[PDB]
Design a protein around this motif. Structure first.
Motif: not given
Ligand SMILES: CCCC(=O)SCCNC(=O)CCNC(=O)[C@H](O)C(C)(C)COP(=O)(O)OP(=O)(O)OC[C@H]1O[C@@H](n2cnc3c(N)ncnc32)[C@H](O)[C@@H]1OP(=O)(O)O
Ligand SMILES: CCCCCCCCCCCCCCCCCC(=O)O[C@@H](COC(=O)CCCCCCCCCCCCCCC)COP(=O)(O)OCC[N+](C)(C)C
Ligand SMILES: CCCCCCCCCCCCCCCCCC(=O)O[C@@H](COC(=O)CCCCCCCCCCCCCCC)COP(=O)(O)OC[C@H](O)CO
Ligand SMILES: CCCCCCCCCCCCCCCCCC(=O)O[C@@H](COC(=O)CCCCCCCCCCCCCCC)COP(=O)(O)OC[C@H](O)CO
Ligand SMILES: CCCCCCCCCCCCCCCCCCCC(=O)O[C@H](COC(=O)CCCCCCCCCCCCCC)COP(=O)(O)OCCN
Ligand SMILES: CCCCCCCCCCCCCCCCCCCC(=O)O[C@H](COC(=O)CCCCCCCCCCCCCC)COP(=O)(O)OCCN
Ligand SMILES: CCCCCCCCCCCCCCCCCCCC(=O)O[C@H](COC(=O)CCCCCCCCCCCCCC)COP(=O)(O)OCCN
Ligand SMILES: [Zn+2]
Lengths: 68, 233, 29, 269, 125, 76, 265, 75
Positions: G109, B205-206, B126, B198, B202
């Protein structure tokens, strides 16, 4: 190089240059004012033009009118 | 090589001549449409033979700039406004890695300060919004906080974290499981396991969000908008 | 279908005449 | 008279080598620093090897000029110019060709800022100086010696270390030009007698004692500035100190030799 | 500008402004390097032959004295530069210009987009 | 080297020619009257030297002519 | 027109065909390495997840800006060159008379690590400086955010508060009214003088005025762009002495004159 | 060998490039102009050579007349 031929063109340059050194110096002695330049036809324009206008009113001998 | 560049250069001569001929032809027909100021931006740009190699499953926003020899892996995403310039050296992005909006990933423009380092980004990485990566290595499953700056020679080891707005100085090594932040970047604390979870989630999810945006952008250009722009008064 | 600028067309004819006449001038001299 | 030589390696090609290098370098972008460096170095090295070959085919038994070749100037052929060497000029050609690559090598590290102009200036200097050493004509000796002033001026002024290079370059140019003009006067003085400036002919003409004295003074005016002889030596410290390293190398190793070469080649015989 | 001097932004010759830098009504004198991700605010002045480290913040009306290396948020004196370092600055500018030449050579004077616009129009009648 | 030769050389030559160029530049005063006066003076000099130099040779000499001209430089 | 017109048009067709053939040959000679320029695919406004941005009539949105998803922008606001407003997983709301400067990123978010995840709320008459990052936070009305500042999730910038240029504001930090905060991490610096409050307001209205000229220029058609190019070239220089000889006075056309509210005076 | 056509073509090409450089443009900005310049340079060099020959021919006769006029003095 070949020594015989190299030493022979060397002789032609000198013999040709010692006797060739005369031509150019004659041009430097040419007069800028030629002999009798005013004799040259380009300079005698009036001698050939003026007779063609010799009968024109304004430049005639006064007696030409009395006899013509 | 040198012959390739000679032909590339000669090619430009022929192309310049052909395009000029086309403009002459248009001028004889009374068309001035070649005078229109249209954007010359290219999402992928080559510098001679150095060209971007992008995986088919990677999202690249149209406004992003990918210049030179840049590799993007499957499931990775280059977001809006991003700039990636590998010309003096290479830039590689692994699979499942997100480069967020307005981020800059580039290499040294000149070798004056020494040999130009490449930029290596591993898998499932990320990279936060408006981050700067300059000739550094970023290993798998690490987190680069947004607005952070990583200078050349830096190494971010796996599960490393660079806090938002941090300034990691040249040749700094960030050890695994550690959070570094500030200007200059310094050890702040250890990463917790929830933070690792996370990081992974994350990233996944991205990759899904990337999919959605790639489908959005891939839709055909609307002809009504084109006609509205054409018929303006 | 048609170029409508008459003066432009005349200028085109003049340029063509200049080019062709120059070629003929070289060829026949 | 075409005096074309028979040997393959001759003087004209050795003249042409650095010229071709300079023309090629004119058109290469300054971004391609490596290419510029290599091209200049290789041109200079090839010229050096060519001069070594010229040494190999030298004939050490003749008093004549060897490898003599000619170059026409006008179709009228009144003025035609010759190149040739002997045992007094050969090693100076070799020294020039040897020193120029050294100059390119000394500035190798700074070439990124030096640019192609540095290499081009030194190559042009090389071409002009080899020409000067290879000329069988007073007038062309003149023309090609003065020509080196321009690139030498540029070399001192641009790549000198400090602002004293300004004064140094001015003094170099002005002293050398004054001497050169004196020797131009001598050349014209000779031409009025002989109608020529060909060295071989002048070696076979007789000059009067009086006009020999005066022509010798006119030659001395140039050459003593070149040597240098006192008291016209003061330009040398300034110029040779303020110049860049390679500039100083060319100034001391080659340019200084031109006055003594002029004494050996025209004044003494 | 708060200093009362004229508020144009002047980037002088041989100046390298690092990527992601923000400049507003500042003056940069010749031969300076601005580090990446730096901020130069209103009326600030960077004197000649000075270097700002990456991430520096120069507040309004602040000055970077000539021949010095500065850095930080806010920027502070780090050390005085050597003459070799200051000699390197125009070299960096020249090298970046040399790189930009390669990009400049990729673009002909005209693009061919107008052809695409033409066919896009024709497909619509 | 740094003394008499400099003074009777580049140092002295530069000084005197700078002063002379200085003086000559001041002649171009910017006044149209000076330029007309110069033309009149040149015309007068032409007539005087090139036609009225017949009986002058009795009292004058060419030596004194050129001497007085050079001597004028050392005035005031 | 006429036969001559038709013939010249046909010859132009031939010349165009030849030129495009030469361009193709030149492309082949380059080894086909050159990626071709294409029609612009950037969308200033874009839907995502069936969310459409709601942008008021008189909002300057620079063509290079990216407004995506569930974004609301109020009257008189301005989004400048290179800005990205990505309202894809949550809502972004921008009040009235608020400027978002060049190269700024605003994002949201879906779920924060801890606490209640909140949308990005930017109030009225707010200045957000160049290249700022606004992430999942709240900026209340008449606040100022400095250029290059970063606001993390849950940050609240209160009314008449300032975040200095370059600041990094950590998550959940609150900037109270009347204070200026700065640094990395951001921390209290000092109170805001009344003159600085007036500055903030002045900033906002100056931007409202700047947005008008930029919006007017960016929306011009091809024909108007050409007309103004010609007009600009004609009036770039002058010969007032020859005009006085002609007895005329050339006046600058109104399409080249800026409004007085953006001029330095 | 080294013909007037080749010297002229090289000079014309050099002229176009020098002109581009003076204007701070790329050497090969408008290549068809380089072709035009090569053609014009070749034409100009060939014409100059022919004109030189003709000029020498006229100077010969004119010097002949000058020499005759001078030699008329010694008559
Ligand atoms: C017409 C257009 C309107 C617009 O939209 S403007 C938007 C573009 N411009 C900006 O964003 C720049 C906004 N200005 C700033 O951020 C200024 O730094 C700020 C906050 C006004 C402070 O400036 P000053 O009042 O002049 O500074 P000060 O006198 O209070 O000095 C106190 C100490 O704090 C430090 N400092 C001030 N500026 C800073 C900063 N941005 N960040 C971090 N640290 C800062 C400064 O070093 C000073 O001294 P010390 O640190 O105590 O030794
Ligand atoms: C399919 C095989 C056939 C391929 C043919 C290729 C031949 C092309 C050869 C290149 C010729 C280059 C000529 C350079 C002159 C450029 C002429 C030009 O630009 O046309 C202009 C102007 O034309 C003229 O004024 C006179 C020159 C035209 C004559 C030469 C035209 C070349 C093609 C011939 C077309 C006519 C043939 C049929 C005639 C009935 C059109 O008018 P405007 O748009 O108003 O001009 C604007 C100003 N500017 C010059 C900068 C563009
Ligand atoms: C400045 C050069 C000195 C003054 C110029 C000068 O003297 O001219 C002579 C240039 O020679 C020099 O004086 C050079 C000396 C310079 C150094 C002192 C050449 O003229 P000439 O005397 O040779 O003419 C007479 C000839 O014998 C008959 O044909
Ligand atoms: C009218 C004012 C003229 C000068 C009057 C000054 C008193 C008399 C001085 C004088 O003698 O005048 C000389 C003027 O002197 C000059 O002109 C200076 C000579 C030129 C000096 C500079 C040369 C320039 C080139 C001419 O000599 P002259 O009077 O004896 O001549 C008489 C003649 O020979 C017999 O009838
Ligand atoms: C700068 C270079 C200056 C060189 C100065 C050389 C000085 C010595 C030269 C010898 C002088 C000389 O021989 O006197 C007369 C030379 O003619 C002359 O008059 C030539 C004069 C030289 C030019 C002026 C030199 C100073 C310039 C300031 C002829 O004398 P001679 O008839 O007795 O011959 C005797 C032969 N055995
Ligand atoms: C029998 C014994 C014989 C002995 C041998 C005698 C032979 C001659 C010996 C003397 C040789 C003198 C050669 C001239 C060298 C002058 C060099 C001065 C140049 C210099 O260093 O600086 C300049 C001086 O200023 C200036 O303005 C200089 C103006 C230029 C002056 C050049 C005049 C030389 C003319 C020839 C005189 C000798 C005649 C010989 C027959 C520039 O300084 P700056 O700062 O003001 O400029 C603006 C800067 N960009
Ligand atoms: C045989 C090779 C050489 C032939 C050269 C053409 C034939 C000779 C005719 C005379 C040519 C003289 C030079 C013409 C250009 C002169 C300078 C014009 C530049 C200028 O400012 O005006 C431009 C007009 O373009 C122009 O004036 C050019 C218009 C179109 C001519 C280009 C086509 C040349 C054909 C070359 C071979 C083609 C092979 C197939 C037959 C507008 O510039 P712009 O906006 O249009 O773009 C330029 C991108 N910097
Ligand atoms: Zn985000």
């Amino acid at each position: 190089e070949n020594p015989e031929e190299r030493d022979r063109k060397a002789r032609e340059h000198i013999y040709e240059m010692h006797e060739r050194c005369k031509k150019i110096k004659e041009m430097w002695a040419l007069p800028i004012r030629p002999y009798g330049f005013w004799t040259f036809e380009r300079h005698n324009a009036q001698l050939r033009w003026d007779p063609q206008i010799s009968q024109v009113a304004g430049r005639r001998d006064p007696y030409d009118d009395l006899l013509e | 090589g040198t012959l390739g560049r000679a032909f590339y250069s000669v090619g430009f001569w022929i192309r310049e001549t052909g395009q000029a001929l086309d403009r002459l032809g248009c001028r004889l027909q009374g068309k001035n449409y070649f005078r229109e100021q249209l954007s010359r931006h290219r999402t992928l740009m080559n510098v001679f033979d150095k060209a971007p190699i992008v995986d088919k499953e990677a999202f690249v926003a149209p406004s992003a700039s990918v210049i030179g020899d840049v590799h993007i892996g499957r499931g990775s995403s280059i977001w809006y406004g991003c700039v990636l310039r590998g010309d003096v050296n290479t830039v590689s992005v692994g699979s499942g890695t997100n480069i967020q909006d307005n981020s800059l990933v580039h290499v040294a423009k000149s070798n004056l300060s020494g040999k130009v380092h490449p930029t290596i980004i591993g898998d499932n990485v990320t990279i936060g919004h408006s981050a700067v990566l300059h000739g550094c290595t970023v290993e798998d499953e690490t987190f680069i906080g947004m607005g952070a700056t990583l200078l050349d020679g830096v190494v971010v080891e796996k599960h490393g974290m660079v806090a938002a707005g941090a300034l990691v100085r040249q040749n700094t090594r960030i050890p695994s499981g550690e959070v570094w932040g500030g200007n200059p970047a310094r050890f702040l604390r250890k990463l917790t396991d929830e933070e690792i979870a996370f990081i992974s989630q994350s990233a996944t999810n991205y990759s899904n969000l990337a999919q959605a945006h790639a489908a959005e952008n891939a839709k055909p250009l609307n002809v009504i908008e084109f006609e509205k722009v054409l018929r303006k008064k | 279908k048609v170029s409508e600028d008459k003066n432009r067309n005349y200028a085109v004819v003049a340029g063509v005449v200049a080019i062709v006449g120059s070629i003929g001038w070289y060829l026949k001299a | 008279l075409e005096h074309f030589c028979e040997c393959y390696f001759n003087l004209s090609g050795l003249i042409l080598c650095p010229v071709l290098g300079s023309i090629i370098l004119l058109f290469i972008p300054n971004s391609r620093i490596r290419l510029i460096r290599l091209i200049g170095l290789c041109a200079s090295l090839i010229t050096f090897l060519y001069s070594l070959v010229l040494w190999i085919q030298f004939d050490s038994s003749t008093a004549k000029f060897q490898f003599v070749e000619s170059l026409r100037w006008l179709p009228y052929e009144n003025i035609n110019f010759y190149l040739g060497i002997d045992g007094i000029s050969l090693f100076f050609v070799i020294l020039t060709t040897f020193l120029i690559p050294i100059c390119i090598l000394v500035g190798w590290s700074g070439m990124r800022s030096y640019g192609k102009e540095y290499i081009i200036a030194f190559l042009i200097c090389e071409f002009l100086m080899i020409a000067v050493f290879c000329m069988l004509d007073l007038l062309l000796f003149y023309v090609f010696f003065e020509s080196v002033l321009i690139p030498m001026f540029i070399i001192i002024g641009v790549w000198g270390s400090r602002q004293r290079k300004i004064k140094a370059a001015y003094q170099f140019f002005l002293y050398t030009l004054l001497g050169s003009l004196f020797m131009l006067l001598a050349i014209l003085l000779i031409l009025f007698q002989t109608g020529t400036t060909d060295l071989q002919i002048l070696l076979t003409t007789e000059f009067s004692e009086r006009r020999q004295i005066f022509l010798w003074i006119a030659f001395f005016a140039s050459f003593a500035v070149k040597v240098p002889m006192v008291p016209v030596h003061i330009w040398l410290p300034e110029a040779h100190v303020e110049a860049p390293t390679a500039g100083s190398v060319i100034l001391a190793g080659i340019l200084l030799k031109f006055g003594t070469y002029g004494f050996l080649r025209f004044s003494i015989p | 500008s708060p200093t009362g001097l004229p508020a144009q932004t002047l980037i002088d010759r041989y100046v390298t402004v690092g990527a992601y830098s923000l400049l507003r009504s500042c003056t940069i004198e010749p031969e300076c390097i601005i580090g990446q991700h730096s901020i130069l605010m209103e009326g600030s002045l960077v004197e000649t032959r000075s270097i700002l480290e990456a991430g520096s913040v120069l507040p309004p009306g602040r000055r970077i004295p000539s021949g010095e290396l500065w850095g930080g948020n806010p920027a502070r004196f780090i050390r005085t530069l050597t003459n070799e370092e200051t000699l390197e600055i125009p070299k960096l500018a020249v090298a970046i210009n040399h790189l930009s030449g390669d990009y400049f050579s990729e673009f002909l004077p005209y693009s061919t987009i107008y052809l695409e616009v033409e066919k896009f129009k024709k497909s619509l009648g | 080297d740094k003394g008499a030769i400099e003074i009777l050389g580049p140092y002295g030559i530069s000084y005197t020619f700078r002063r002379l160029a200085e003086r000559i530049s001041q002649l171009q005063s910017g006044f149209v009257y000076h330029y007309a006066f110069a033309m009149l003076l040149g015309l007068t000099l032409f007539v005087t030297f090139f036609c009225m130099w017949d009986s002058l040779s009795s009292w004058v000499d060419n030596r004194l002519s050129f001497i007085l001209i050079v001597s004028s430089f050392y005035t005031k | 027109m006429g036969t001559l017109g038709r013939a010249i048009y046909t010859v132009g067709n031939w010349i165009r065909g030849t030129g495009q053939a030469l361009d193709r040959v030149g492309s082949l000679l380059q080894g086909s390495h050159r990626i071709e320029e294409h029609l612009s695919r950037h969308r200033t406004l874009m839907n995502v997840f069936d969310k459409s941005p709601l942008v008021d009539k008189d909002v300057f949105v620079a063509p290079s800006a990216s407004v995506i998803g569930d974004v609301q922008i109020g009257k008189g606001s301005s989004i400048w060159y290179g800005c990205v407003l990505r309202g894809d997983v949550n809502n972004i709301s921008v009040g009235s008379g608020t400027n978002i400067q060049d190269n700024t990123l605003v994002h949201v978010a879906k779920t924060n690590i801890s606490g209640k995840v909140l949308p990005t709320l930017i109030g009225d008459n707010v200045t957000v400086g160049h290249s700022a990052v606004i992430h999942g936070c709240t900026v209340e009305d008449d606040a100022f955010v400095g250029m290059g500042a970063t606001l993390l999730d849950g940050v609240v910038v209160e009314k008449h508060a300032m975040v200095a240029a370059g600041s990094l504001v950590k998550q959940n930090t609150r900037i109270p009214s009347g204070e200026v905060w700065g640094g990395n991490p951001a921390k209290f610096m000092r109170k805001l003088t009344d003159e600085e409050i007036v500055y903030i307001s002045q900033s906002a209205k100056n931007y409202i005025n700047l947005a008008q000229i930029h919006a007017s220029e960016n929306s011009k058609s091809f024909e108007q762009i050409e007309v103004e190019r010609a007009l600009r070239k004609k009036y770039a220089r002058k010969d007032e002495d020859y005009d006085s000889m002609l007895g005329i006075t050339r006046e600058t056309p109104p399409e080249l004159i800026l409004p007085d509210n953006v001029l330095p005076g | 060998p080294i013909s007037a056509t080749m010297v002229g073509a090289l000079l014309g090409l050099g002229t176009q490039m020098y002109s581009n450089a003076l204007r701070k443009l790329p050497y090969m900005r408008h290549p068809w102009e380089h072709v035009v310049g090569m053609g014009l340079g070749a034409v100009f060099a060939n014409q100059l050579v022919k004109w030189d020959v003709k000029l020498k021919e006229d100077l010969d006769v004119m010097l002949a007349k000058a020499r005759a006029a001078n030699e008329r003095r010694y008559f």
